[PDB]
Amino acid sequence: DQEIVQMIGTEEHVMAAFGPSLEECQKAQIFTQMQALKYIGNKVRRQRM
Amino acid sequence: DDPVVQEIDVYLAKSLAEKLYLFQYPVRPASMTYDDIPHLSAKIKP
Amino acid sequence: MLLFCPGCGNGLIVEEGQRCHRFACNTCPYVHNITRKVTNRKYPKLKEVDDVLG
Amino acid sequence: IINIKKEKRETDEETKQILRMLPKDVSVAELLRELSLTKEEELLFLQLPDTLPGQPPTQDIAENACTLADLTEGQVGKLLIRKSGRVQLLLGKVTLDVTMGTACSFLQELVSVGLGDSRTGEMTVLGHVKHKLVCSPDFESLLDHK
Ligand SMILES: [Zn+2]
């Protein structure tokens, strides 16, 4: 998450605005690449079989 | 604007041309280093 | 406010331990006990007096 | 509480969130304070152009790219610091200009990974990298020359 925040910005207001997204992500158990990819795939639909 | 001072020379070394790597930690500030952290091993591929 | 663990870099929540409140990461055993006061002011812009237009 | 493992603030330049109680430098002043104000050695990381103003010496060719891997040891160029803060690198008949690169604040460790044996090698930490330089061809001079 530190790298993500550094990529978004280091300004105080930037972190203040991005805090809610970090908190929402923390509420879930997504912390690795595999978990996020599995979540995305769960949020994917086949193009009509 | 003439070169009044600091006429430094530039030399070239080929001893560690194939053995020199640059490791940078995007998440670790330069203030804290891993000098005191005991390392165990490093896996690598040529 | 937002703080990150030096170990992995994830966000640090605040939790009540066995001795004192502490910052802790949800993906590693790293913790940090609070010794002195820690504050994070925001200084909202207030309402101003608006005037008698007309 | 341990002092060398405190929580780090988002700003890498102002990680000192809790205490026990930076202006943008220039290459000329950088070298001046590195040599005149102090005498301790420093590790720098400079970025050279893709092709150097030279020819691969007996490297089996074509006007291909000439990098440091083709040049030999010894004196290859000089570093001049003119007035008004100009920092040039005379690498032969042409002269490049050296400027300050992106101010990196994260940890950069220059190490030497030497595989002496095919089964066991040695990793040697040479030092730490703090500043970054960028060398660029003085295209204006190359154009006004001919
Ligand atoms: Zn952590």
Swiss-Prot record, chain A:
It is found in: Nucleus; Cytoplasm, Cytosol. It comes from the Eukaryota. Component of the RNA polymerase III (Pol III) complex consisting of 17 subunits: a ten-subunit catalytic core composed of POLR3A/RPC1, POLR3B/RPC2, POLR1C/RPAC1, POLR1D/RPAC2, POLR3K/RPC10, POLR2E/RPABC1, POLR2F/RPABC2, POLR2H/RPABC3, POLR2K/RPABC4 and POLR2L/RPABC5; a mobile stalk composed of two subunits POLR3H/RPC8 and CRCP/RPC9, protruding from the core and functioning primarily in transcription initiation; and additional subunits homologous to general transcription factors of the RNA polymerase II machinery, POLR3C/RPC3-POLR3F/RPC6-POLR3G/RPC7 heterotrimer required for transcription initiation and POLR3D/RPC4-POLR3E/RPC5 heterodimer involved in both transcription initiation and termination. Belongs to the RNA polymerase beta chain family. It is linked to Leukodystrophy, hypomyelinating, 8, with or without oligodontia and/or hypogonadotropic hypogonadism: An autosomal recessive neurodegenerative disorder characterized by early childhood onset of cerebellar ataxia and mild intellectual disabilities associated with diffuse hypomyelination apparent on brain MRI. Variable features include oligodontia and/or hypogonadotropic hypogonadism. This is DNA-directed RNA polymerase III subunit RPC2. It comes from Homo sapiens (Human).
UniProtKB/Swiss-Prot annotation, chain B:
It comes from Homo sapiens (Human). Component of the RNA polymerase III complex consisting of at least 17 subunits: a ten-subunit horseshoe-shaped catalytic core composed of POLR3A/RPC1, POLR3B/RPC2, POLR1C/RPAC1, POLR1D/RPAC2, POLR3K/RPC10, POLR2E/RPABC1, POLR2F/RPABC2, POLR2H/RPABC3, POLR2K/RPABC4 and POLR2L/RPABC5; the stalk composed of two subunits POLR3H/RPC8 and CRCP/RPC9, forming a structural mobile part that protrudes out of the core and functions primarily in transcription initiation; and additional subunits homologous to general transcription factors of the RNA polymerase II machinery, POLR3D/RPC4-POLR3E/RPC5 heterodimer and POLR3/CRPC3-POLR3F/RPC6-POLR3G/RPC7 heterotrimer. It is found in: Nucleus. DNA-dependent RNA polymerase catalyzes the transcription of DNA into RNA using the four ribonucleoside triphosphates as substrates. Specific peripheric component of RNA polymerase III (Pol III) which synthesizes small non-coding RNAs including 5S rRNA, snRNAs, tRNAs and miRNAs from at least 500 distinct genomic loci. Assembles with POLR3D/RPC4 forming a subcomplex that binds the Pol III core. Enables recruitment of Pol III at transcription initiation site and drives transcription initiation from both type 2 and type 3 DNA promoters. Transmembrane segments: none annotated. Signal peptide: none annotated.
UniProtKB/Swiss-Prot annotation, chain C:
Zn(2+) 1 binds at C5, C8, C25, C28. Belongs to the archaeal RpoM/eukaryotic RPA12/RPB9/RPC11 RNA polymerase family. This is DNA-directed RNA polymerase III subunit RPC10. A zinc finger (C4-type) spans 5-28. GO terms for molecular function: DNA-directed RNA polymerase activity; nucleic acid binding; zinc ion binding. Its main location: nucleus. The keyword Zinc applies. One of its GO terms (cellular component) is RNA polymerase III complex. It comes from Homo sapiens (Human). Core component of RNA polymerase III (Pol III) which synthesizes small non-coding RNAs using the four ribonucleoside triphosphates as substrates. Can mediate Pol I proofreading of the nascent RNA transcript. Anchors into the Pol III active site to constantly monitor transcription fidelity, cleaves mis-incorporated 5'-ribonucleotides and restarts the transcription process. Once Pol III reaches the poly(dT) termination signal, can induce Pol III clamp opening and transcription termination.
Swiss-Prot record, chain D:
Keywords: Acetylation, Antiviral defense, DNA-directed RNA polymerase, Immunity, Innate immunity, Isopeptide bond, Methylation, Nucleus, Phosphoprotein, Transcription, Ubl conjugation. Its main location: nucleus. Sumoylation on Lys-5 can serve as a signal to mark misfolded Pol III for proteasomal degradation. It is found in: Nucleus. There is a cross-link at K5, K16, K146 (Glycyl lysine isopeptide (Lys-Gly) (interchain with G-Cter in SUMO2)). GO terms for biological process: defense response to virus; innate immune response; positive regulation of innate immune response; positive regulation of interferon-beta production; tRNA transcription by RNA polymerase III. GO terms for cellular component: cytosol; nucleoplasm; RNA polymerase III complex. The keyword Protein biosynthesis does not apply. GO terms for molecular function: chromatin binding; DNA binding. Belongs to the eukaryotic RPC4/POLR3D RNA polymerase subunit family. DNA-dependent RNA polymerase catalyzes the transcription of DNA into RNA using the four ribonucleoside triphosphates as substrates. Specific peripheric component of RNA polymerase III (Pol III) which synthesizes small non-coding RNAs including 5S rRNA, snRNAs, tRNAs and miRNAs from at least 500 distinct genomic loci. Assembles with POLR3E/RPC5 forming a subcomplex that binds the Pol III core. Enables recruitment of Pol III at transcription initiation site and drives transcription initiation from both type 2 and type 3 DNA promoters. This is DNA-directed RNA polymerase III subunit RPC4. The chain holds residues 137 to 396 of 398 of the full protein.
